[PDB]
DNA sequence: AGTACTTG
RNA sequence: AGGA
DNA sequence: CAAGTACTTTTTCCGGT
């Protein structure tokens, strides 16, 4: 569909970063993070991306 | 008055089981919510829905 | 315990 | 690990 | 091409490793 779903959009170019409500930090005590799994996997993506960028 | 029936009466060994009502009874009407889903928490202990 | 699927 |  | 393979929805709702 030329408006809502073109084939080119099955390939990811720019990635949507969901907000905290989706990946809340289970913040124990006052001085302790407790980040979500999604928050860690997103940082992995970032790191993997930064390397590739500088590398090229 | 005498019962028209005769009852099968005699001692029998009975065990007391771990399931007691007051340890099972639960009611909730607004209370803790989960964080992600923002829905009621789970469990009598946690005062869930 | 079955079904389309998958891999030899 | 238990409950109907 | 077929055998043997993985997955899957595989009943519901109620103490704490
Ligand atoms: N795993 C399960 N899932 C859902 N329902 C269950 C269940 N196990 C038991 N039940 C429910 O509990 C009822 C009672 O089963 P049981 O506690 O074993 C006594 P019974 O088999 O009905 O014989 P009885 O009335 O002559 O004593 C069932 O008919 C069923 O509705």
From Swiss-Prot, chain A:
Entry's localization field: Nucleus
Q: Where is this region: Lid loop?
A: 24-36
What superkingdom does the record give? Eukaryota
PTM comment = The tandem 7 residues repeats in the C-terminal domain (CTD) can be highly phosphorylated. The phosphorylation activates Pol II. Phosphorylation occurs mainly at residues 'Ser-2' and 'Ser-5' of the heptapeptide repeat. The phosphorylated form of Pol II appears to carry, on average, one phosphate per repeat. The phosphorylation state is believed to result from the balanced action of site-specific CTD kinases and phosphatases, and a 'CTD code' that specifies the position of Pol II within the transcription cycle has been proposed.
Q: Function, please?
A: DNA-dependent RNA polymerase catalyzes the transcription of DNA into RNA using the four ribonucleoside triphosphates as substrates. Largest and catalytic component of RNA polymerase II which synthesizes mRNA precursors and many functional non-coding RNAs. Forms the polymerase active center together with the second largest subunit. Pol II is the central component of the basal RNA polymerase II transcription machinery. During a transcription cycle, Pol II, general transcription factors and the Mediator complex assemble as the preinitiation complex (PIC) at the promoter.
UniProt note: domains:
The C-terminal domain (CTD) serves as a platform for assembly of factors that regulate transcription initiation, elongation, termination and mRNA processing.
Could you share any additional remarks the record makes about this protein? Mutagenesis experiments demonstrate that the minimum viable CTD contains eight consensus Y-S-P-T-S-P-[A-S-N-G] heptapeptide repeats. Identical and simultaneous substitutions in a number of consecutive repeats are lethal: 'Ser-2' -> 'Ala-2' (14 repeats), 'Ser-5' -> 'Ala-5' (15 repeats), '2-Ser-Pro-Thr-Ser-5'-> '2-Ala-Pro-Thr-Ala-5' (10 repeats), 'Ser-2'-> 'Glu-2' (15 repeats), 'Ser-5' -> 'Glu-5' (12 repeats), '2-Ser-Pro-3' -> '2-Pro-Ser-3' (15 repeats) and 'Tyr-1' -> 'Phe-1' (12 repeats).
Instruction: Indicate the family of this protein.
Output: Belongs to the RNA polymerase beta' chain family.
Its quaternary structure? Component of the RNA polymerase II (Pol II) complex consisting of 12 subunits. Interacts with DEF1; the interaction is direct and serves to bridge RPB1 to the Elongin complex in a DNA-damaged dependent manner. Interacts with the Elongin subunit ELA1. Interacts with the Elongin subunit ELC1. Interacts with ASK10. Interacts with ESS1. Interacts with RTT103. Interacts with SHE2.
The protein here is known as DNA-directed RNA polymerase II subunit RPB1
Per the UniProt record, the lineage of the source organism begins with:
Eukaryota, Fungi, Dikarya, Ascomycota, Saccharomycotina
Could you tell me the gene encoding this protein? Answer: RPO21
From Swiss-Prot, chain B:
Q: Where does this polypeptide localize? A: Nucleus
What protein family is recorded? Belongs to the RNA polymerase beta chain family.
The record's function comment reads:
DNA-dependent RNA polymerase catalyzes the transcription of DNA into RNA using the four ribonucleoside triphosphates as substrates. Second largest component of RNA polymerases II which synthesizes mRNA precursors and many functional non-coding RNAs. Proposed to contribute to the polymerase catalytic activity and forms the polymerase active center together with the largest subunit. Pol II is the central component of the basal RNA polymerase II transcription machinery.
Q: What else is known?
A: The binding of ribonucleoside triphosphate to the RNA polymerase II transcribing complex probably involves a two-step mechanism. The initial binding seems to occur at the entry (E) site and involves a magnesium ion coordinated by three conserved aspartate residues of the two largest RNA Pol II subunits. Present with 18700 molecules/cell in log phase SD medium.
| Oligomeric and partner information | Component of the RNA polymerase II (Pol II) complex consisting of 12 subunits.
Kindly provide the name given to this protein in its UniProt entry. DNA-directed RNA polymerase II subunit RPB2
Look up and give the organism this protein is from: Saccharomyces cerevisiae (strain ATCC 204508 / S288c) (Baker's yeast)
Name the encoding gene, please: RPB2
Parent-record interval covered: 1079 to 1127 of 1224
């Amino acid at each position: 569909n030329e408006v809502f779903s073109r084939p080119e959009w099955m390939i990811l170019t720019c990635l949507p970063v969901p907000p905290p409500p989706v990946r809340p930090s289970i913040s124990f005590n006052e001085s302790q993070r407790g980040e979500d799994d999604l928050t860690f996997k997103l940082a992995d993506i970032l790191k993997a991306n930064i390397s590739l960028e500088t590398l090229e | 008055k005498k019962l028209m029936a005769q009852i099968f009466f005699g001692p029998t060994y009975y065990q007391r089981l771990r399931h007691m009502v007051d340890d099972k009874i639960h009611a909730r009407a607004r209370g803790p919510m989960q964080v992600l889903t923002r829905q009621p928490v789970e469990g009598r202990s946690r005062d869930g829905g």
